[PDB]
Design a protein around this ligand. Structure first.
Ligand code: AKG
Ligand code: AKG
Ligand code: AKG
Ligand code: AKG
Ligand code: K
Ligand code: K
Ligand code: K
Ligand code: K
Ligand code: MG
Ligand code: MG
Ligand code: MG
Ligand code: MG
Lengths: 498, 498, 498, 498
């Protein structure tokens, strides 16, 4: 039981030597230089996130180039994520660049772009032209991470609502608007998004973080926008509104993975319900073996402070205990004063939660929910994890070309590293969002076809030794095909490191 | 399984109507007025915490009086907790009252009191005579809530360590000192703590939150200092260092309850290990049926902001899921700008977490770890909870004078309220730290002795109706003694509300 | 797990001192005298079965009187069961009283009663007039516990079938015929059965063993035949054909209990399938808490031998492990040479299987299948058994007037005796088919109404002491109503024997 | 749960097509001819048992020759078992060669060989020199398979006990003696056993059923007597008294397998305790993966009758449910009138019991008791069974030369056949005592060395098809080594049948 497992926990034992969970860092001014990126990577970054809510194509191109240069110097394969703007709504600019409101201030909000630059305490612009169809008198507009709310008093006309300010708040340029409980019908892929996505394909990004996904159909729109050359790019759908939560099953089935995007989510639904959504969404991803990211304000105070709060540490640990493959940093690394240190904390907290995890519970819980009969590769991958537990294997080794088999092993939550020997660099980069996996590139064009698997297995076992996963005489669980079968692994071996 | 339970969560269904968990609020200039306290109570405060690290007796007298006045106005019974300053290690003074250190600076620390008032960059005093025994070369000394770290290079004489400064820091007079992982031999109660406890006893406080408890023996010294007249006051031991974690079993045995005092703990042990200690301590308290409080920075950012961060919401939810009876607010209510709103959020989060709890799992886990044969009252109390689940009881009712039986029922974590009819006002106030319990005072001096239980049961059942726990025709599970057994409850009945 | 429980079993530990399972003995020439009955009772008989397939009303009246006289001398309350003939089919008599057949002998079987007395190797009578409608050419007739089978070659006419003898067998007067897989449409209550049943009511039998029950509707026919004065007589339906197995759910729901009547069953369906039917039927009875009897050839060889076979001992033990309340003897006691000794073996084997039983497994398995919410008396009775386990109670004590509450406790399979204080002698006698129960008669007409339960509880606790179930200072779990509630028990107490 | 599994049983659905359990038949005048043996084999005999308690070497030579001739005709590999007479305690002779005792008769028993040939009612010899040490006053001596009981009243001198006769009995010369609950210090092998073992080794028997095994040391003496040339012959220890039950762990460790020899056991310990010993011993054998045989009177009445009793059917079914690999027939096939029909019934019962088994429960129970870390071959074998369940495999295929790997797979109780391709005819014959296994001989002298496994795997897969275990497109789970590992299997593959 969890209770019995808990009472046996010790703060005095060694922690796991190899961190299983993965860290996604958002790049910005704190962290864009090749040197800053190197330090992020050394610190524990596996995936660099570009937030296309801001910055030009040239800015992000600098990010892309600097990431690749940093990773090449270190000999790492780092994933690159493009995080779409999507159907964001914002205020315009203000006179002087801030204005201040008191509870009871009457204020007009207007869709008329004439006011975009010159917002004031009594009138300012919101960049959503259908505003007055979307929110009626009596409705509420949420401003600036939902910190300030306006009750709509009346509709002055098709361009303008008169609003009552409900609480005190200071407002600066271009803050976020949310309209929970309104008919908001913006595309999942705007014209801006489409060009962004095309740019991502041209530049070979590994994955898309698709903002505000509401439906399976929207996932398919993102896939269509990525077009012929973007077919192998992962789509990680971000769940950040009511409807995305409602439609979680079909959204998961359509996507390659999920981000619990807790920032918008906690404004779109009551903040206290995010803790339940998170648990639900993460576990649904674990059951089907698709990567899941927990995001937003995880170590927030370390944007300014050299140490996190007690709540922030527990948040990171519990996202790991919940089942999340990855945990994410936004402003902490994009613009914070302690980018390296915040990644380093996050890494240490991950390893602690990982060592606190009751090792076979996830394996059994996930196994028990799978439909029988399995396909053979799933029976192989799950039974290979069971073998690993049985012999206390210090590593597993899998050949995977698309990544599918590495993800299938990771689905069953082994307690040791999964060394994946892959023939694709992109697979190395994409498997960064998958718990436990460490990728090694085998260049088939250069080294030969390796039909009998022996070159790739050697590469994997030498890597296991060199990187101090295991030594001579240690048993390793090795998964791939026999000499005939093509398309999936049908074989497991147990092998002593030579 | 937890996994299966997670995937079936219904995020948008109605939540539990009655909050089971309990909220401790620290009182301060934000919250001390009778009007503020009433609002705090309406918002969901069950226990008022007085932090005797600051403020004079006269200050706390006002808190005591105002709490009682506010509670009486609302017809509530509010616990009053005295949280001791506790013993401390501090540096001496410095020349000019400050010195600045840079990484790599070499500084001596001495326990020779001659240096107490003339600390320099070269040498300064720490008022712990056993220093040179407690930390060896290579050990660490923490200064100023762990913000500066010293590595001990060598022992220079029996009173002096040469140290290496690890990071930039400016020291002022008498900063706090921590010796991480180090045995520390301070008395349980300082001379100030004695005057503070004497004050708490004379003013009738309900419980002591005893600071820096390292051993069971110290708990007994606190108990001894409270004396005959304080014998009924709860001691809630605050676990703040590795010794307390290590000795948790015997500390729990000696105490009435535990606080996981995470702020100080995460200074003494690595921050990431606080999550392990927390899970362990809460579960160990659950197993023996003693109240446990989770504390420190749970909703910190609401000190200044009207909404909490995402990490803060998950911290509160998880402390509940961990099994904590109570959660606590410090600066958030003592000095924050949104005291009512922070308690209200805290209430709403507790309720979500409670509604997501897999109802019978805790009951079964707890029951399965109890030694058989049990005492009769514990068989009665656990089986009564079992019965409650079996009939979907909307409430339980227990007669308890000391509070014992009420805590013994709450030990088994029913999913409905536990109405406790008690003959002691102090019992009403003390049961505020115990999950699920709601107390009704029976005035035996006024209404008579009630040998046959009927008046107390009627009072409890009327309360269930009046307070909308249950209605006519609902089954209530009712626990007390038969006509002849004294000293404990030997009887459970299932009763339909008339 | 069963496996782990098994490997911990010991032949060297003391056995349970109080036998929980009950023994049904069939009365006949070996056992009909008052003195033989006394010895049966001393030996372990709880229920005397009268087999109305044979003997006149006067013969069974002698059984009834002798049972009551024997039980009165011993101060026991022994149940009396009437086991109906029902739709039995038999051969007639033969010339000389036996005939012998060889494989390939052609033989005519006739419904013509002219041949009833004078059967021969070539022609004999069967007492089922619709024979030639029921079995066609190609069908098989099973004779003498299915030991000999005849293939029907042709229908000579409406009264006569020509048959091929399939195997060697000797035939004596009035052997049984079975026709599995034929349309046999005899009543469940023949004219003979009706008079038998009426006789049973006139003579106050406690229960009916209703032969060949196929449907719920047939159970209702037996109930109707028992009429106004027979309403409180138990109907135990005997399952002994295919259709009875098929309809097990509705048959259980209509009956008071079930006998797995393995003799006819193992001829009506393939013998090897009886082991699966038995497991299924017994467990279905356990789940709804209705008494179930395992019958037929359990200690068969002890009809002639002073000791049983290894198979017979394991059969008795495993019927107990399967969950059966009772085990039954037929010819072993009706006509065997070792009636007392065979009952004594059966008793010892019961106690051994009882001590081998993993004590709380049945409790949990049965509990986990009950619909929630329960009615209050079921939550009381189940939670009272859980209390008993928790304190290692040596006895439980329940007040029951109809027996319902004693059966409800027994449903949850406590490991100690259930002392039932009852106001009805018939309840004492009927509860003999219920595992664990020991009944004590409280004569309310003589001793008073006992509204506060105190006389009956005293009677029960004195009985517990006198019969060496428990001593002064032992905790006993006592179930009945509080001072108000009528119709069911709503209360449980734990009480130390004074 | 078992209960829930029982209630869902479908009595009339199709049973398993392939019998997993194995049947040992004792050969005798009913069954010794080549024609009888072929029929026995067709009826389902897998092992022929020669009981060396009776018959000359020449008699058993005929059995050996005839078994081999019958097996060769049918293309079968039939195990041959030699069941030793074993050491014994017997009385001496009597004057006139018989004496009769009545209950209450007082008789001396002496170990003074002077009295060996002149036993009377007053005094007679027992040939066990340690008698007066082994049983004290109040202890029991059993005579003539436990049919007469003596209570020891007193020790008269160091060679003589005065005894009280408990029951009527007529003694003839040299009856068997048992000392129940008594340590007995006889050699493992008698002088006759030596000549018998020497004969078994010279004639190439596959296994010894070693009688009256009390200690591990005795197993080693049997092993020593078999010598270098008998080193590959299985020793199946027969557990026949309390010492054997007590020392079961170390006896199992020393043996290749166990027989629960219930006839002799139920003479030495109370008959009702045989069911406890049986459950314990079978489960202990299951846990270490060694073959266990249940023996004695399983279908006794079919010695004379063409159908079994109800108890006999449940005995066979329950031995299977208990976990026994094999069940055994003695007099039923040695000298009974229906040898073919008894084996056929036994087969049909085994199949019902197998079809009612809750498929994965044994697997999980067995796996959960294994020490971690396992050896690699045991992880491979258990995980291969896991895989089989996961894909609903219709067969497994294993390469095993010693039989080890085959037994190791059968340890985990798959629900399909285990096809074992072996290079040894003796391995085919020996694997007859192991549940599920079906052996195919690969002739390496004839077809070559098959380093890369392909010929043996093809042979096994062809067998699966030919023998209708599986078809084209069915997944088979295949266990052997990779190209380089020697001595054990380190590899599992899932293969579709071509
Ligand atoms: O906002 C972030 O920091 C990235 C994830 C996101 O879009 C959200 O949490 O709303
Ligand atoms: O810091 C607080 O809020 C009070 C609890 C305590 O002493 C601690 O967390 O260290
Ligand atoms: O036949 C008996 O011995 C009584 C139960 C019965 O009717 C049967 O087993 O067929
Ligand atoms: O008795 C048999 O059938 C052979 C097994 C044995 O020796 C026994 O059961 O005592
Ligand atoms: K974005
Ligand atoms: K304090
Ligand atoms: K009958
Ligand atoms: K023998
Ligand atoms: Mg967002
Ligand atoms: Mg503190
Ligand atoms: Mg019958
Ligand atoms: Mg024997």
């Amino acid at each position: 039981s969890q209770l019995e497992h808990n009472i046996g926990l010790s703060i005095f034992e060694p922690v796991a030597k190899h961190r299983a969970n993965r860290i996604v860092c958002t790049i910005g001014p704190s962290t864009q230089s090749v040197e800053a990126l190197k330090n992020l990577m050394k610190s524990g970054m596996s995936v660099a996130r570009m937030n296309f809510s801001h910055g030009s194509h040239e800015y992000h191109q600098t990010t892309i180039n600097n990431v690749r240069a940093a990773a090449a110097e270190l000999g790492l394969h780092i994933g690159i994520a493009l995080d779409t703007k999507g159907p964001e709504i914002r205020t315009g600019l203000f006179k002087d660049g801030e204005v201040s409101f008191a509870p009871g201030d009457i204020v007009c909000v207007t869709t008329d772009p004439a006011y975009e630059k010159v917002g004031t305490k009594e009138k300012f612009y919101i960049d959503y032209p259908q505003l007055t169809n979307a929110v009626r008198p009596g409705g509420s507009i949420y401003v600036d991470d939902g910190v300030m709310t306006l009750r709509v008093v009346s509709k002055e006309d098709d361009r303008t609502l008169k609003c009552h300010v409900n609480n005190h708040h200071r407002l600066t340029d271009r803050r976020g608007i949310n309209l929970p409980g309104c008919e908001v019908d913006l595309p999942a892929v705007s014209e801006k998004d489409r060009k962004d996505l095309e740019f991502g394909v041209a530049q070979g990004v590994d994955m898309i973080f698709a903002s505000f996904i509401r439906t399976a159909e929207q996932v398919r729109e993102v896939r269509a926008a990525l077009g012929e050359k973007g077919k192998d790019i992962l789509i990680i759908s971000k769940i950040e509104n009511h409807q995305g939560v409602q439609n979680i099953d079909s959204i998961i089935e359509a996507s390659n993975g999920i981000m619990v995007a807790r920032g918008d989510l906690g404004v779109e639904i009551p903040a206290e319900k995010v803790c339940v959504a998170q648990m639900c969404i993460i576990s649904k991803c674990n059951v089907v073996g698709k990567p899941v990211i927990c995001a937003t304000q995880m170590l927030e105070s370390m944007t300014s402070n050299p140490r996190p709060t007690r709540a922030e540490v527990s948040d990171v640990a519990n996202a790991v205990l919940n089942g999340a493959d990855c945990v994410m940093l936004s402003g902490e690394t994009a613009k914070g004063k302690y980018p390296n240190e915040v990644v380093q904390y996050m890494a240490r907290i991950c390893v602690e939660a990982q060592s606190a995890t009751h090792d076979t519970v996830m394996f059994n819980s996930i196994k028990n929910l799978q439909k029988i009969p399995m396909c053979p590769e799933e029976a192989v991958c799950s039974s290979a994890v069971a073998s690993a537990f049985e012999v206390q294997a210090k590593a597993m080794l899998v050949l995977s070309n698309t990544g599918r088999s590495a993800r299938l092993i990771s689905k069953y939550r082994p307690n040791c590293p999964i060394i994946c020997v892959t023939t694709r660099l992109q697979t190395c980069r994409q498997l960064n969002v998958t718990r436990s996996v460490v990728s090694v590139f085998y260049d088939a064009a250069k080294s030969g076809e390796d039909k009998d698997k022996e070159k790739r297995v050697k590469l994997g076992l030498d890597f296991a030794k060199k990187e101090k996963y295991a030594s001579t005489g240690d048993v390793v669980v090795v998964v791939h095909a026999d000499h005939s079968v093509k398309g999936y692994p049908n074989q497991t071996r147990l092998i002593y490191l030579p």
